[PDB]
């Protein structure tokens, strides 16, 4: 609930965001998430163009990892640049699982 200290939180989140290396590979935040079955169904529900963008950026990341190189500095993902595309879908899936479970315990 902090104010300016919350801006400080934005600062440390930005620094930690640059501490994570996926920006070096062009990845969006959501590409990095571990793909358990909930995430699997979450990816299944993605719109085709977005799913294509995801698969291609994943290939670009793996390909850069092949030759142990790095994406050029101009092309790095920026902290404000990201679109958190997978969140609504994954939240729908997880909420559905929690609903099925809460029904299942009764």
């Amino acid at each position: 609930a902090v104010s300016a200290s919350g801006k400080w939180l934005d600062g440390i989140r930005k620094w930690y965001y640059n501490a994570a290396g996926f920006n070096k590979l062009g990845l969006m935040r959501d590409d990095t998430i571990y793909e358990d079955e909930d995430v699997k169904e979450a990816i299944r529900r993605l719109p085709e163009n977005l799913y294509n963008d995801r698969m291609f950026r994943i290939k670009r990341a793996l390909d850069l990892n092949l030759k142990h190189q790095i994406l050029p500095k101009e092309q790095w993902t920026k902290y404000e640049e990201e679109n958190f595309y997978l969140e609504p879908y994954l939240k729908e899936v997880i909420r559905e699982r929690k609903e099925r479970e809460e029904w299942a315990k009764k």
Partner: protein, 144 residues
């Protein structure tokens, strides 16, 4: 071993076949053992059969000082300094403990040359097989 102990104040003289590799520091421990025999420091005393060699862990070895000048005469005719003698002893013990030393050094020389030859070649072969992946481009072409 019992008669050996009885002949030696209960002490048992160790087999010398592995004496170099057995003790820490190897042959280096033995020469230093055969050399140091300082008279005991003031404030300490020992059993009359015991002898004060500091390098020995008990610091009171039962062994009598085995060697000194001209205990022996080499057939080579080289002088019998106790240092020369102790050096020859540690050398011969070092061989008795590692007979395969020379052949091992030889193979070692051969293997280094061999590996020195093989590594660049096999690594170059890996670079060759992998070059198609290392160099490959890829692009993204949405229809619109």
């Amino acid at each position: 071993s019992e008669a050996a102990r009885a002949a030696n104040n209960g002490a048992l003289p160790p087999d010398l076949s592995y004496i170099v590799r057995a003790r820490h520091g190897g042959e280096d421990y033995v020469f230093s053992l055969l050399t140091g025999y300082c008279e005991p420091p003031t404030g300490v005393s020992l059993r009359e059969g015991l002898y004060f060699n500091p390098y020995f862990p008990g610091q009171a070895i039962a062994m009598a000082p085995p060697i000194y000048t001209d205990v022996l005469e080499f057939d080579d005719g080289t002088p019998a300094t106790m240092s020369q003698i102790a050096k020859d002893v540690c050398t011969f013990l070092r061989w008795a403990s590692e007979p395969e030393h020379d052949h091992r050094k030889r193979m070692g020389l051969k293997m280094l040359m061999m590996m020195a030859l093989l590594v660049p070649l096999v690594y170059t072969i890996k670079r060759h097989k992998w070059s198609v992946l290392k160099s490959r481009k890829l692009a993204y072409r949405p229809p619109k």
